[PDB]
Design a protein around this ligand. Structure first.
Ligand SMILES: O=C(O)CC1CCCC1
Ligand SMILES: O=C(O)CC1CCCC1
Ligand SMILES: O=C(O)CC1CCCC1
Ligand SMILES: O=C(O)CC1CCCC1
Ligand SMILES: O=C(O)CC1CCCC1
Ligand SMILES: O=C(O)CC1CCCC1
Lengths: 275, 286
């Protein structure tokens, strides 16, 4: 599958370009600066109108020999009313066992029901042609994966997660990750556009930062991709672009019940049925 | 072993209070919080946390007692202190005892613990003093004890994927049972006392030092490194979280605020660069 694998590589590089262009257009102030290494292409945006810290990475890496390639991204907006988001699409080939993985997910601070519904609707719509149960399966997997067990708490409002994807022919699995990659932009960008101009306060930023401690915890304690990258000698700063620009931790920190800070965990993180 | 283990518990609970007293004496106005709990198996904990002081921003001192293929009992104190002023180092200490039953023989026991210093704007004299207290407390127990446990501290408190030490070191030990129980117990008592003797003078000396917004920003970037060590590497933290321990008690180690920046490194030749240029790789203080 040398031609097929190169087809996946060409798609991933273009996907990175396209996602970067789309986020640059929304921000329209800041841009992605590229760090090429050997290998990979790490693109980072800081201090924009909208994006406080964002990273969109392409990597191509080489007891069993393997080749892997993928795009991974995490966007941390300045405005607490714009959710953090994450997406991934990847291919693993173990020499000739192959599989795809990926997904996207939304991490609100001050959540809006309609946005959560829209985000999931984009996900449901893109999965439908690939199988009647694909959305249910990979939405459920997203809920199970992006969970902090020791806090009994979801990371976000969900989306799609999949791994070990090879149940369909290579062509169809490839088409699926193309749909997921395009879908990320269709799901997230309209929410960015709708919420980026919402006024916010210093107190709302403080809440955002406490919530970003939860995000950091997931990525550093739990996330499998992060752990493998760090263990296998990957590029530290490329792997850890996911970390928030600022986080807070407080002893016994919990929002007072009946505050909008509390509603995130009282309602939004526990709903788990958006469409 | 019941009486012996009870004596260790008594020591640990007193040490928790003594350390809190020593730290508050320097601060004068930190708010103290306490949580206590027990577990159905037996055991439990007591966490004391000082926050929003003139000197200590977030300082936690935890006592826990755990019962859990063989049955075991464990108890210990763990603490992490994060000052408000960048010129006062963060510090950490631990003393612990494990006792595990074995079939067909007497239980196996061991102690572990240590203390260590995590500066932001380090000072050579302070690093030397900190290590001298450690060297002096070890001397009565054996001529190679400081060298062993200082070296172990350097090995353990290291972030391999950044090729960077966490701090300037101190003492670290585990599996300590090469001496009779009573001598090992005396050693962890000396380590616990030693923590105060090593750290409190530095707090007293540095707490009034002027600081700037830029220095606090640097402190926060450095605290990202600290969070990484505890969440990615630290074995005790992992084991606590995996075992269903009290989350907020385990995570007292995390800094009040941290920053992460893509490729962030201090500018060479600046005061912010001194920590990594000189202090972290010196590893020779007495
Ligand atoms: O999706 C990514 O982050 C890249 C893949 C994961 C490890 C190498 C390729
Ligand atoms: O997390 C990211 O955004 C980058 C990927 C995470 C693990 C490998 C690369
Ligand atoms: O090379 C690896 O171990 C994979 C890392 C994950 C993101 C970049 C490289
Ligand atoms: O010293 C501690 O932090 C407590 C010990 C570790 C697990 C139980 C006792
Ligand atoms: O949660 C407990 O009962 C004890 C835990 C062990 C380390 C800190 C808390
Ligand atoms: O980090 C602390 O200070 C608390 C201990 C860490 C592992 C168990 C408790």
């Amino acid at each position: 599958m040398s031609l097929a694998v190169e087809a996946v590589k060409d798609f991933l590089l273009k996907l990175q370009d396209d996602i970067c262009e789309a986020l640059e257009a929304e921000d329209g102030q800041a841009t992605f600066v590229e760090d090429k290494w050997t290998g990979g292409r790490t693109r980072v945006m800081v201090d924009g109108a909208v994006i406080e810290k964002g990273g969109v990475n392409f990597s191509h890496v080489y007891g069993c020999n393997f080749e892997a390639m993928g795009v991974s991204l995490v966007i941390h907006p300045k405005n607490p009313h714009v959710p953090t988001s994450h997406a991934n699409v990847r291919l693993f080939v173990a020499e000739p066992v192959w599989w795809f993985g990926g997904g996207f997910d939304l991490t609100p601070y001050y959540a809006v029901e309609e946005d959560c519904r829209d985000f999931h609707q984009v996900a449901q719509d893109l999965c439908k042609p690939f199988g009647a149960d694909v959305y249910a399966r990979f939405k459920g997997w997203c809920d199970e994966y992006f969970f902090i067990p020791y806090r009994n708490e979801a990371r976000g409002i969900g989306g799609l997660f999949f791994d070990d994807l090879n149940e369909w022919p290579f062509e169809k699995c490839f088409e699926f990750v193309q749909a997921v990659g395009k879908g990320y932009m269709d799901a997230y960008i309209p929410i960015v556009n709708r919420r980026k101009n919402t006024p916010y306060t210093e107190q709302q930023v403080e809440f955002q930062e406490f919530r970003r401690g939860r995000y950091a915890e997931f990525n550093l304690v739990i996330d499998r991709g992060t752990k493998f990258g760090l263990q296998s000698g990957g590029r530290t700063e490329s792997i850890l672009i996911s970390l928030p620009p600022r986080a807070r931790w407080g002893y016994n920190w919990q929002p007072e019940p009946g505050t909008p800070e509390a509603r995130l965990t009282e309602y939004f993180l526990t709903k788990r049925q958006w469409v």
